Amino acid sequence: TGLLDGKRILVSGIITDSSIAFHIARVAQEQGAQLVLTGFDRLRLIQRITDRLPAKAPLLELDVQNEEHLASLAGRVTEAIGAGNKLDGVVHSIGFMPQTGMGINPFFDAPYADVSKGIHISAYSYASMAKALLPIMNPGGSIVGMDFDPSRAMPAYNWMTVAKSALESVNRFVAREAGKYGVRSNLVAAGPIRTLAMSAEEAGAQIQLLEEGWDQRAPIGWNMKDATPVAKTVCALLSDWLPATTGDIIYADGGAHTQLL
Amino acid sequence: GLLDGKRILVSGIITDSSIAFHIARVAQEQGAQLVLTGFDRLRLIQRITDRLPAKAPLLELDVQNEEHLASLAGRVTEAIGAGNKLDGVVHSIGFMPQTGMGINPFFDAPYADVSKGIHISAYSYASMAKALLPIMNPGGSIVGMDFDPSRAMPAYNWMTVAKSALESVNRFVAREAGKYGVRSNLVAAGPIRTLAMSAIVGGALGEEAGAQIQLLEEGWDQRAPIGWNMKDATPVAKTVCALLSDWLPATTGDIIYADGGAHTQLL
Amino acid sequence: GLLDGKRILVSGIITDSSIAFHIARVAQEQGAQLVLTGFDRLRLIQRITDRLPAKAPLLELDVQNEEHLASLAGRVTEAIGAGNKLDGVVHSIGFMPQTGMGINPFFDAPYADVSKGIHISAYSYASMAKALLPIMNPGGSIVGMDFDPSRAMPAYNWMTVAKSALESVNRFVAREAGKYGVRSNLVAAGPIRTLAMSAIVGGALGEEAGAQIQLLEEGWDQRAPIGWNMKDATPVAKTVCALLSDWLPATTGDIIYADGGAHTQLL
Amino acid sequence: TGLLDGKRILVSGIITDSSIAFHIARVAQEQGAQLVLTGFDRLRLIQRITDRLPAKAPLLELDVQNEEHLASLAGRVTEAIGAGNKLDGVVHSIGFMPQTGMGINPFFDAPYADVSKGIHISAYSYASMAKALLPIMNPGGSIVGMDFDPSRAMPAYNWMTVAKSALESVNRFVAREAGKYGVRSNLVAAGPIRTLAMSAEEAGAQIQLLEEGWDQRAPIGWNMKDATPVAKTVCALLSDWLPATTGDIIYADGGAHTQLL
Ligand SMILES: NC(=O)c1ccc[n+]([C@@H]2O[C@H](COP(=O)([O-])OP(=O)(O)OC[C@H]3O[C@@H](n4cnc5c(N)ncnc54)[C@H](O)[C@@H]3O)[C@@H](O)[C@H]2O)c1
Ligand SMILES: NC(=O)c1ccc[n+]([C@@H]2O[C@H](COP(=O)([O-])OP(=O)(O)OC[C@H]3O[C@@H](n4cnc5c(N)ncnc54)[C@H](O)[C@@H]3O)[C@@H](O)[C@H]2O)c1
Ligand SMILES: NC(=O)c1ccc[n+]([C@@H]2O[C@H](COP(=O)([O-])OP(=O)(O)OC[C@H]3O[C@@H](n4cnc5c(N)ncnc54)[C@H](O)[C@@H]3O)[C@@H](O)[C@H]2O)c1
Ligand SMILES: NC(=O)c1ccc[n+]([C@@H]2O[C@H](COP(=O)([O-])OP(=O)(O)OC[C@H]3O[C@@H](n4cnc5c(N)ncnc54)[C@H](O)[C@@H]3O)[C@@H](O)[C@H]2O)c1
Ligand SMILES: CCCCCCc1cc(=O)c(Oc2ccc(N)cc2C)cn1C
Ligand SMILES: CCCCCCc1cc(=O)c(Oc2ccc(N)cc2C)cn1C
Ligand SMILES: CCCCCCc1cc(=O)c(Oc2ccc(N)cc2C)cn1C
Ligand SMILES: CCCCCCc1cc(=O)c(Oc2ccc(N)cc2C)cn1C
Ligand SMILES: [Cl-]
Ligand SMILES: [Cl-]
Ligand SMILES: [Cl-]
Ligand SMILES: [Cl-]
């Protein structure tokens, strides 16, 4: 029947109805998965948004910068899914880099305190999440994080590129640790998606050009307005169908990164 | 099934240890309807394929044969019925003459030999795609088999060069395939104990090569964060089926590593 | 000399086994005029640098110190004379607290520790470039030190993550540096027997880590087609000087591997 | 004094005065190197062109598809540089792919006989050259070939991209063999240069756009009309200043391959 039938999966990172996490969660539920959701800060808002999912799922608070949150997470998840049950899947869909580290703001003018906070949330927390949740994961399990290909520099993405580069490195080490539990760890490198995070002059035309250029570069085409292909890719990694891939990066980007022009 | 209703051509079965044999087995278990192609030893391939979960038509295909390639689409169509198309194609074909591997010095492989190996192992990926794309459905998937050649290694020699060529070919096939709504990708598998692999470890391409490849196998499992069972092609087969499925719809021109994660680890 | 007439800032000398010590030595032998920066143990650095081929001014620089960075250009200018500019900058600076390496579990490094290591090892490459670019000549060259982090490995742990960050930072520094006609690159060196390296092999970060890194060293020379002498930083120093010279004028945002070719070989 | 003083270096691949090899040879001679030149087919023409170099150098015939040429090469070189002397450097600057494997001609319509010939000349011959010349190279020596970054597909370059991908693989193995002699083997991945090989509709404007785009992508800028930066990079690899790099690729491309946009 379903790709993820009877799988118990934690999904972090829903803040709006256009969040990549929201669509991962939707597709997961459509594929039979039982979800536990984690949210940061605006919990009333997130509750409202998660009520728009196909099925009701427990919502837990998790600020990845808060050590007490991380320390209590496994026990809170356990209360949510019942004692004796474990997670088969964990989705990290969390990213942040202050504005000083982004966009038209000069690369050299981002204070390290700002960069450090961004690396904390966007890269380090992937290890933190794994640390907190691996002790309640089943063998055969899967941890997935969200990446945006940082192998080459580019305008605007700036210090977030550096954080993603750090994330890829972190992922390779998480895989070493996860392996001990029989759990895989991977990243999905997504093409650009018009989530509300796109906010990070003539931004509109330029973002549309990004869309047209990415679609042209991608041999199978690309639609920035549609998170679904990315959500399906995450679910694939959550499933039993990529059992020998770990510490690795799957590109759900239309194939654009394989083409120079 | 993961592949329910899908029509999929699978090449490259020669024995029951063939990676393609296991791709076929898993695909069938997941509801796929198959067309098989075999090279040269058709009687062998017939009795081998007779041990798959379901019966499937077996077609002849020598990728060096222009007539075979030119007639392939029509022969496949006769196999699956007029009006039907393929949703999937598996290229599981490789060859490099002995002079191009093992303890034979790298400089001593004649180009005639290397060129044959590149023909079969790399170019045929393009020519198969050319042959079959006009009878593939949008949403379709072409998959080939790779052995990561980004770094040199003992004994693999000119086959390494062939695989590097294959990776480059794959990126261009994706450009063509995309015009049909079809994806093209490679699976880079870890080392699998096929009959040939065991022979190599046992010194068939020379004793020094054997010892080196024995070490390669062992280091592979050591480096793989989830470990690596060289006697089990199933994880590789599942990965191929993942790419044949609707669940990786935005991946093309790319390489998926079904290697236990070994290529992500230095040691 | 390869670097005749060039004015070059070299950071990162702490002892006579420092990679930067040898970069400085070779640069001076090739006609370069140096400005040195030292962190914290200035008396030690003074007597160490006193053993270089020529005397060079020594300036204080803690890359975590905003005042140090803000005054650096002016202090360098006082060192080399008004009207003169730097043709070269060497970043040879790395640190990661012990919790972020060795047998200490990867999950147990507090972020405060990791963040300090990333500050010193990666961000400071940007901030040094910011500090010094306004007093660099067109044709100039910024070089930093890298240890290839494309694949994970034992014990290196969070320093690996720092180096991955450094590589990404380097690509952005190149975008800024290019506006001045300045190149930015990293040299990925093979493992060098510094005092710290020997300590690690001898179990200073834990016995299991020691054994793993001992094996890393040996496999490195094994895999390197020209071999690798871990007791000799000179080939690494020469490579840095190559990038500081006029002979790689079209390379920027990039990584040169001075590792014996080991990263090109699986085994 | 000179970067390559007293070094004996073989340079293949001069066909015109805009050949990358011609400028490698010019810069090498300016840096004190003694050269032996090899040429293919139009030897009268090549002689005329090589007379325009800073210093006279022996010209030897070498069709890399001709096994007798390869077999006699070391002895012919030895006659050129005198008995007892050896080569310190070898430049492979040779490339060919028939038109069917290029440009507007559909990727699928290149016959393998055409592709095979291109791979023979552009990739396999790098191993052949090394095989023929390594027995007369000094330890500390250097073999360099010319590459154009094939890690991603692109319009027009087509099957030549596949040949270059093959070349990079060949180079990693040549390095294993060259190492036994104390010799390095590397490739220089050049940005696009307006040599007469650029011939491979509105080609002019498009080639100019290639120039503007490459210059923009390259953080240090790029001039397609100027082979000199590439020639200097080859000489660097020929020199004693990159003694620990082998089996590797140096990018003389303005840094363009390190930037997505
Ligand atoms: N949108 C794109 O184009 C794109 C492309 C590739 C990769 N990504 C990655 O995908 C993931 C989701 O991004 P998105 O596009 O859905 O935008 P988003 O804003 O909807 O999701 C980002 C999430 O991070 C969460 N978060 C921020 N700080 C946190 C903290 N201290 N503790 C816990 N959670 C915190 C936010 O609350 C939010 O839900 C990120 O890692 C992002 O970098 C996005
Ligand atoms: N076994 C491994 O460890 C390993 C690892 C990674 C990738 N691969 C790749 O997987 C694929 C299958 O190889 P295998 O290991 O299952 O061994 P195999 O011998 O069972 O399969 C190779 C196939 O190539 C077919 N073939 C050879 N010449 C042909 C031609 N002219 N026309 C049509 N078919 C032809 C053979 O008949 C055979 O069925 C290859 O591309 C191989 O390089 C193998
Ligand atoms: N030794 C190896 O095998 C190896 C291999 C590849 C790359 N590297 C890199 O080479 C560089 C030099 O390291 P090394 O091996 O010569 O050891 P080292 O200890 O001799 O040099 C490291 C330097 O970092 C300086 N430093 C630390 N914190 C600083 C700060 N807050 N401000 C300014 N300087 C500071 C130290 O004072 C010291 O001089 C580093 O970036 C290192 O990671 C080392
Ligand atoms: N021009 C560019 O933009 C560019 C960019 C990157 C790499 N490259 C590479 O640089 C090298 C030189 O190319 P170029 O631009 O100077 O064009 P070119 O035509 O001037 O040089 C190519 C050379 O290959 C030689 N050659 C062809 N077949 C041969 C054979 N059978 N035997 C011996 N020699 C043979 C030719 O005679 C010629 O001298 C090539 O390998 C090419 O692919 C060129
Ligand atoms: C070349 C154009 C770059 C496109 C970037 C795509 C992209 C990549 C992203 O990583 C992203 O997510 C964030 C980015 C910043 C912050 N603070 C928070 C988040 C969640 C959004 N988008 C849209
Ligand atoms: C020396 C081999 C080490 C590589 C191990 C993995 C591996 C990689 C392979 O590409 C492979 O397939 C072939 C290789 C050569 C030929 N002629 C035919 C085939 C089918 C088998 N194996 C086992
Ligand atoms: C566990 C280490 C294995 C890596 C070997 C090579 C290597 C790589 C290095 O990056 C390195 O430099 C440091 C690493 C950490 C700190 N705190 C400070 C420094 C200066 C030393 N060495 C020797
Ligand atoms: C995206 C645009 C592609 C630019 C390609 C640059 C480029 C790369 C090349 O490899 C090249 O050299 C040849 C190519 C073909 C043949 N038959 C012979 C030769 C010598 C020329 N040029 C000009
Ligand atoms: Cl809660
Ligand atoms: Cl048939
Ligand atoms: Cl001072
Ligand atoms: Cl002659």
Q: State the Cα–Cα distance between residues A251 and A242, nearest whole angstrom.
A: 14
- Ion ligand 11 neighbours (CB, 5 A) are C 59-60
Among A27, A223, A246, pick the best mutation site for testing chain B contact (most B Cβ within 10 A). A246
CB contact under 8 A, C152 and B264: yes
Task: Answer yes or no: are the C-beta atoms of C134 and C73 closer than 8 Å.
Answer: yes
Nearest CA-CA partner of D121 in D138, D143, D144, D146: D146
Q: Strands C86-91 and C254-258: what pairing?
A: unpaired
User: Which residues lie closer than 8 Å to C63 by C-beta, 6 or more apart?
Assistant: C39, C69, C93, C119, C120, C124, C127, C128
The verdict on domain C1-267 having CATH code 3.30.365.10 is no
Q: Strands A34-39 and A59-61: what pairing?
A: parallel
Chains with at least 3 CB pairs less than 8 angstroms from chain A: B, C, D
Q: Does A172 touch chain C (CB under 8 A)?
A: yes
CB contact under 8 A, C119 and A120: no
Among B148, B212, B213, B266, pick the best mutation site for testing chain C contact (most C Cβ within 10 A). B266
Q: State the Cα–Cα distance between residues B21 and B7, nearest whole angstrom.
A: 16
Three-state DSSP string of chain A: CCCCCCCEEEEECCCCCCCHHHHHHHHHHHCCCEEEEEECCCHHHHHHHHCCCCCCCCEEECCCCCHHHHHHHHHHHHHHHCCCCCEEEEEECCCCCCHHHCCCCCHHHCCHHHHHHHHHHHHHHHHHHHHHHHHHEEEEEEEEEEECCCCCECCCCHHHHHHHHHHHHHHHHHHHHHHCCCCEEEEEEECCCCCHHHHCCCHHHHHHHHHHHHHHHCCCCCCCCCCHHHHHHHHHHHCCCCCCCCCEEEEECCCHHHECC
Q: Is B116 exposed, middle or buried (0-12, 13-18, 19+ CB in 10 A)?
A: middle
Task: Answer yes or no: are the C-beta atoms of A129 and D235 closer than 8 Å.
Answer: no
CB contact under 8 A, C168 and A153: yes
- Residue whose entry in the numeric block shows the structure tokens 């068939």: B204
Strand order in C33-38's β-sheet? C58-60, C33-38, C7-11, C86-91, C136-146, C183-189, C254-258
Q: Is C179 annotated as a binding residue?
A: no
In whole angstroms, how large is the CA radius of gyration of chain A? 18
Q: State the Cα–Cα distance between residues D112 and A18, nearest whole angstrom.
A: 48
Q: State the Cα–Cα distance between residues A143 and D209, nearest whole angstrom.
A: 44
- Distances in Å between the alpha carbon of D32 and those of D35, D227, D240? 9, 19, 14
Q: State the Cα–Cα distance between residues D197 and D20, nearest whole angstrom.
A: 10
Q: D129 vs chain B: nearest CA distance in angstroms?
A: 10
CB contact under 8 A, D123 and B161: yes
From the list C178, C253, C264, the residue facing D175 with the nearest CB is C264
Query: Which one-letter amino acid corresponds to residue B108?
Result: D
CB contact under 8 A, A127 and C106: yes
Nearest CA-CA partner of B114 in D167, D187, D109, D106: D167
- Distances in Å between the alpha carbon of A98 and those of A112, A120, A139, A158, C54? 11, 12, 37, 11, 46
Q: C176 vs chain D: nearest CA distance in angstroms?
A: 8
Give the chain C residue whose CA is nearest to the CA of D222: C250
Q: Is B140 annotated as a binding residue?
A: no
DSSP C41: -
Task: Answer yes or no: are the C-beta atoms of B92 and B20 closer than 8 Å.
Answer: yes
Sketch the domain layout of chain B as residue ranges.
Answer: 1-267
- Resolution (angstroms) equals 2.3
Within 10 A of D252 (CB to CB), how many other CB atoms are there? Answer: 27
- Distances in Å between the alpha carbon of A177 and those of A247, B64, B247, C152? 10, 47, 27, 12
Q: State the Cα–Cα distance between residues C202 and C188, nearest whole angstrom.
A: 24
Q: State the Cα–Cα distance between residues D9 and D25, nearest whole angstrom.
A: 9
- Tell whether ligand 2 has an atom less than 6 A from the beta carbon of residue B127: no
DSSP assignments along B87-98, one per residue: EEEEE------G
Three-state DSSP string of chain D: CCCCCCCEEEEECCCCCCCHHHHHHHHHHHCCCEEEEEECCCHHHHHHHHCCCCCCCCEEECCCCCHHHHHHHHHHHHHHHCCCCCEEEEEECCCCCCHHHCCCCCHHHCCHHHHHHHHHHHHHHHHHHHHHHHHHEEEEEEEEEEECCCCCECCCCHHHHHHHHHHHHHHHHHHHHHHCCCCEEEEEEECCCCCHHHHCCCHHHHHHHHHHHHHHHCCCCCCCCCCHHHHHHHHHHHCCCCCCCCCEEEEECCCHHHECC
From the list A3, A247, A253, the residue facing B250 with the nearest CB is A253
Q: Does B153 touch chain C (CB under 8 A)?
A: yes
- Distances in Å between the alpha carbon of C162 and those of A59, C122, C124, D116, D221? 34, 6, 11, 44, 29
Strand order in D34-39's β-sheet? D59-61, D34-39, D8-12, D87-92, D137-147, D184-190, D248-252
D28 Cα–ligand 4 center, Å: 18
Q: Is C189 helix (H, G, I), strand (E, B) or coil?
A: strand
Within 10 A of C112 (CB to CB), how many other CB atoms are there? Answer: 11
B239 Cα–ligand 10 center, Å: 28
Supply the residue whose CA is at minimum distance from atom 30 of ligand 3: C62
Q: Strands A248-252 and A184-190: what pairing?
A: parallel
Within 10 A of A189 (CB to CB), how many other CB atoms are there? Answer: 22
Q: Is D194 exposed, middle or buried (0-12, 13-18, 19+ CB in 10 A)?
A: middle
Q: C202 vs chain B: nearest CA distance in angstroms?
A: 19
The verdict on domain A1-261 having CATH code 3.40.50.720 is yes
- Residue whose entry in the numeric block shows the structure tokens 């200018």: C77
- Distances in Å between the alpha carbon of B220 and those of A168, B216, B228, B262, C151? 21, 6, 7, 6, 14
